């Protein structure tokens, strides 16, 4: 389903995903990709660069294509991504970790 999007990398490892979004250092703050979960099959992960460090956010994709991130529900993964391009990801560390999604790592 998600294989038509350039930011979807399928079953890449957590370590590989982290290195992909960290490659350009803190200048790539907000750069992201989406992958299959490596430790919980059937689930997905948004991996993104935060101040040069990789962070990983679990996503649930329903059979209808809708996307849940913890308490937040979106009609699609694309809608979730656009939401976090416009509004900061509400992480626990608050303003010291402000991040909006920016670019993405293109799948090979």
């Amino acid at each position: 389903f998600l294989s038509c999007y350039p930011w979807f990398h399928g079953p890449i490892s957590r370590v590989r995903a982290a290195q992909l979004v960290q490659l350009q250092g803190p200048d790539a703050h907000g750069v992201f990709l989406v992958r299959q979960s490596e430790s919980r099959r059937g689930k997905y992960v948004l991996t993104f660069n935060l101040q040069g460090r990789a962070k990983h956010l679990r996503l649930v994709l329903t059979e209808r294509g809708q996307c849940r991130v913890q308490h937040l529900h979106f009609p699609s993964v694309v809608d979730m991504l656009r939401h976090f391009q416009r509004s900061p990801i509400p992480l626990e560390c608050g303003a010291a970790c402000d991040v909006r999604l920016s670019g993405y790592v293109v799948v090979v």
């Binding site: 957590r14 430790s39 992960v45 962070k55 990983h56 956010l57 679990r58 991130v69 913890q70 308490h71 937040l72 990801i89 509400p90 992480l91 626990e92 608050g94």
Partner: peptide, 8 residues
């Protein structure tokens, strides 16, 4: 491993 938690 570890995954991020959001403020709720």
């Amino acid at each position: 491993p570890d995954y991020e938690l959001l403020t709720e």
